Amino acid sequence: YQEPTDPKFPQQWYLSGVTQRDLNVKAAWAQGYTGHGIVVSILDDGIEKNHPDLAGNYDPGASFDVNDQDPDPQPRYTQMNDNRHGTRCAGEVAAVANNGVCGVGVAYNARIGGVRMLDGEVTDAVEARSLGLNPNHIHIYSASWGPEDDGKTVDGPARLAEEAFFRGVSQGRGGLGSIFVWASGNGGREHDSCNCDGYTNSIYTLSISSATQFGNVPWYSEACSSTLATTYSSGNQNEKQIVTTDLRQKCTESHTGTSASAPLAAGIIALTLEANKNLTWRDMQHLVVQTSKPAHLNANDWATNGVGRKVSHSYGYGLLDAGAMVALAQNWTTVAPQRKCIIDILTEPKDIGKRLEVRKTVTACLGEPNHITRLEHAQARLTLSYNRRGDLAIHLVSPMGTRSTLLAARPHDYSADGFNDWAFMTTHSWDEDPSGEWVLEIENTSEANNYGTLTKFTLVLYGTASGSLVP
Ligand SMILES: CC(=O)NC[C@H]1CC[N@H+](Cc2cc(Oc3cnc(N4CC[NH+](CC[C@@H](C)C(=O)[O-])CC4)nc3)nc(-c3cc(Cl)cc(Cl)c3)c2)CC1
Ligand SMILES: *[C@@H]1O[C@H](CO)[C@@H](O)[C@H](O)[C@H]1NC(C)=O
Ligand SMILES: [Ca+2]
Ligand SMILES: [Ca+2]
Ligand SMILES: [Ca+2]
Ligand SMILES: [Cl-]
Ligand code: NA
Ligand code: NA
Numbered sequence: 097y098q099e100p101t102d103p104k105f106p107q108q109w110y111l112s113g114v115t116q117r118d119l120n121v122k123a124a125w126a127q128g129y130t131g132h133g134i135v136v137s138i139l140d141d142g143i144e145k146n147h148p149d150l151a152g153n154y155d156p157g158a159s160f161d162v163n164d165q166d167p168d169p170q171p172r173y174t175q176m177n178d179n180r181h182g183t184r185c186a187g188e189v190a191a192v193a194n195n196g197v198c199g200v201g202v203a204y205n206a207r208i209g210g211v212r213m214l215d216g217e218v219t220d221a222v223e224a225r226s227l228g229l230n231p232n233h234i235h236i237y238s239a240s241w242g243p244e245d246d247g248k249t250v251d252g253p254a255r256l257a258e259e260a261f262f263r264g265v266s267q268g269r270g271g272l273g274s275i276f277v278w279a280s281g282n283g284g285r286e287h288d289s290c291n292c293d294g295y296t297n298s299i300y301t302l303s304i305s306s307a308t309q310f311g312n313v314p315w316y317s318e319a320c321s322s323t324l325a326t327t328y329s330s331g332n333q334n335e336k337q338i339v340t341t342d343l344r345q346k347c348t349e350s351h352t353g354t355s356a357s358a359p360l361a362a363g364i365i366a367l368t369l370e371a372n373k374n375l376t377w378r379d380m381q382h383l384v385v386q387t388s389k390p391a392h393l394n395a396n397d398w399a400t401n402g403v404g405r406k407v408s409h410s411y412g413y414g415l416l417d418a419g420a421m422v423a424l425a426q427n428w429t430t431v432a433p434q435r436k437c438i439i440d441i442l443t444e445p446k447d448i449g450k451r452l453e454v455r456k457t458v459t460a461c462l463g464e465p466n467h468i469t470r471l472e473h474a475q476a477r478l479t480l481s482y483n484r485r486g487d488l489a490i491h492l493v494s495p496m497g498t499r500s501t502l503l504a505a506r507p508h509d510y511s512a513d514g515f516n517d518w519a520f521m522t523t524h525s526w527d528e529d530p531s532g533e534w535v536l537e538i539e540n541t542s543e544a545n546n547y548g549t550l551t552k553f554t555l556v557l558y559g560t561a562s563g564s565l566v567p
């Protein structure tokens with residue numbers, strides 16, 4: 097295998113590292129996987145389709161302009177270079193290799209497009225028309241943004257966008273399901289808690305957080321239980337950043353944030369789909385769970401779950417490992433059809449006060465076609481009132497003892513509107529047997545005499561009843 101000759105490839109430390117602090121992408125390339133035949137679309141502020149490092153891989157069939165309602169996603173050029181982010185992300189996935197320009201994409205032979213959707217009012221329809229763009233041509237969608245990362249917002253896809261997610265994973269990609277890759281958020285300095293973002297909190301999105309070059313949790317990271325894995329991104333000013341294509345036919349060495357991590361994951365997923373084009377949207381999440389690597393990622397919350405995997409709310413199952421992903425994809429057996437077990441927990445509303453614990457022993461739909469012995473995602477769908485929402489911290493403990501943080505305290509969240517059937521999601525009990533006692537904890541983290549009521553707690557289990565590995 098001959099590694100890329102591009103002038104800035106040596107500066108793409110998260111690929112070309114010889115120190116083991118990288119995404120192990122060269123190993124995938126050396127197995128023959130470069131993204132050939134795979135189609136990725138960047139949902140953002142547009143894509144400079146004539147960029148010298150993107151033109152050779154540019155695919156109009158992966159592109160649209162929902163802001164101006166035309167097929168051409170070219171960015172709006174301004175003095176401050178406002179609409180450059182989509183172009184930066186496109187190059188992370190699929191910048192051309194061995195052409196004397198900038199560096200390379202993770203999947204440097206994949207086809208790449210962009211949806212111009214963020215340069216205008218982002219409505220439910222705009223979101224739905226973007227997520228649902230050409231779903232039998234585009235394999236993988238990359239989205240780096242969502243509701244405001246101000247640490248006080250609770251919002252997610254409205255009706256059309258949620259319908260687009262279910263249509264995508266159900267009928268997209270020939271029935272195998274669109275793969276939606278999401279950044280878990282940039283709200284770290286606002287103490288944001290990312291299950292409050294219904295896009296990254298969705299089971300239908302494969303959610304990605306960031307690690308700095310030295311293996312630390314960056315200032316901008318949000319912790320939450322819905323995150324699945326991690327890719328490198330920026331950190332302090334002694335740590336390197338992401339190197340990629342930039343607006344006006346330039347390169348950049350200063351692409352940053354969790355919003356730079358999701359495209360790298362999308363590229364790794366593109367290599368993996370080249371290795372096995374029959375992978376379903378759920379198969380891809382299984383591969384990520386099984387192959388991601390905690391080693392050398394620093395966090396104070398690494399915990400071993402019930403099947404022996406380390407999980408963190410900052411990192412999910414750890415750093416993506418592209419060589420391992422493509423190796424395991426090749427002979428992967430398609431997972432069984434997805435089951436869903438609905439358990440309405442409360443017999444009466446419960447006063448929260450200073451602290452509430454709800455314990456329930458469940459059989460996970462024993463005797464039914466939705467019996468689950470092998471969990472994938474789990475949700476605690478909660479309806480509650482509270483006088484100051486951000487004073488609440490919420491945890492969910494599985495029968496195997498895995499304590500998922502569903503919500504951390506959010507000091508800026510002064511809302512008195514509570515949670516209205518909010519489906520807090522955790523990935524940390526993946527492959528556990530969910531039969532047994534679940535424990536929900538709601539606590540007032542403030543010394544204030546806060547008050548409210550939990551009126552509904554639905555435990556929703558997804559998964560299967562076959563195919564488990566030895567822990
Ligand atoms: C009841 C109803 O009908 N309820 C409609 C709302 C439902 C909730 N939704 C949330 C939402 C807001 C949002 O709002 C924005 C707007 N704009 C940005 N931008 C633009 C500026 N950019 C500058 C970057 C520069 C500084 C740089 O390069 O650093 C940052 C990102 N981000 C988020 N997006 C998304 C979204 C983003 C992507 Cl990607 C894909 C999809 Cl599907 C949805 C979603 C808004 C409409
Ligand atoms: C894809 O997987 C399905 C489900 O196991 C199987 O029926 C089908 O034959 C597979 N197709 C290919 C081309 O491998
Ligand atoms: Ca246009
Ligand atoms: Ca190049
Ligand atoms: Ca957030
Ligand atoms: Cl469902
Ligand atoms: Na965000
Ligand atoms: Na997700």
Ligand code: NA
Nearest residue numbers: 400401402497
């Ligand atoms: Na444990």
Ligand code: NA
Nearest residue numbers: 495530531532
């Ligand atoms: Na059990």
